[PDB]
Amino acid sequence: PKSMQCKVILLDGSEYTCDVEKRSRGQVLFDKVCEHLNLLEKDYFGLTYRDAENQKNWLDPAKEIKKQVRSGAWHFSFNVKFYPPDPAQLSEDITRYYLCLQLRDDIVSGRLPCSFVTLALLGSYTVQSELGDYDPDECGSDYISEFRFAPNHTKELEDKVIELHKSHRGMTPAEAEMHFLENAKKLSMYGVDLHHAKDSEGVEIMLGVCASGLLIYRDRLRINRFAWPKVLKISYKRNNFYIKIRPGEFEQFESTIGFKLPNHRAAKRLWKVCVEHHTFFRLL
Ligand SMILES: Fc1ccccc1NCc1cc[nH]n1
């Protein structure tokens, strides 16, 4: 029995190493990672890898690892796949904890945009969770936190984190994590997976996939939103991704909206994440 070494970047930025039999399916590796993390509420999470383009791909738990990574290194990341719309309803604090770590990276990366005040408030709850009660002894008027809070740090943002941290005295890690999530869940890009595409006229749009449905970002105005119930059918052909939308009441025939993706793999990736998110919606 020949086994392949796997390396997984965890959400704290540490590396987990294990071996699986070389013909193992994704689920085998994912189960080992989740046992390592003491994670029971595993359905919200997954593993990603980077292809030659260094584009992120979900490791399909049902398929052989070798037929996915193909020529690439057995190097993965552990990530939230399905962002819970209501994190208070998760059964375990440790689940909310990993979700916070993911969202912290979502924020620092700029995938999840955030006002100055929300950056500072989220940051204050992270500090309360990580270090406990505000201590003047560690924080001078010149203090800069080890914690990454934002895509671009300023002294103003560090000061506001400290100001808000002072107000959280006596808050436990689980409580601070729950407040963090109550705020983060409201942000317009929470749990939105964005894909580059062109509309049928060749105009650059972004397609967002999330729990509630599909978003077509055409410009700062004209954001079209199709709740999952409004989406009849989706499919990809060559570089094209198509969504069929239910007609309005007493209208004949659904509408088709077509999109051009960069290449066939990008169309297939978008199709698969939409199918997977739509099933998630069907279970809610
Ligand atoms: F309702 C949706 C449908 C499809 C994709 C996303 C959403 N987000 C919630 C919302 C409702 C109104 N504006 N934002």
Cβ < 6 A, ligand 1 pocket: 210, 212-215, 225-227
Amino acid at position 264, single letter? H
The ligand 1 atom nearest the CA atom of 226:
4
Whose CA is closest to atom 11 on ligand 1? 225
CA 104, 108, 113, 115 torsion-angle sign: positive
Question: In the numeric block, which tokens belong to residue 184?
Answer: 């983060």
Angle at alpha carbon of residue 65, lines to 62 and 67, rounded to 5°? 95
Whose CA is closest to atom 13 on ligand 1? 225
What is the CA(224)–ligand 1 centre distance, in A?
9
Amino acid at position 239, single letter? N
Under 8 Å between Cβ of 77 and 69: no
Under 8 Å between Cβ of 29 and 6: yes
What is the C-alpha separation between 175 and 98, in angstroms, rounded? 14
What is the C-alpha separation between 213 and 226, in angstroms, rounded? 6
**Deposited experimental method:** X-ray
Q: What count of residues does the chain have?
A: 284
What is the CA(284)–ligand 1 centre distance, in A?
15
What is the CA(228)–ligand 1 centre distance, in A?
10
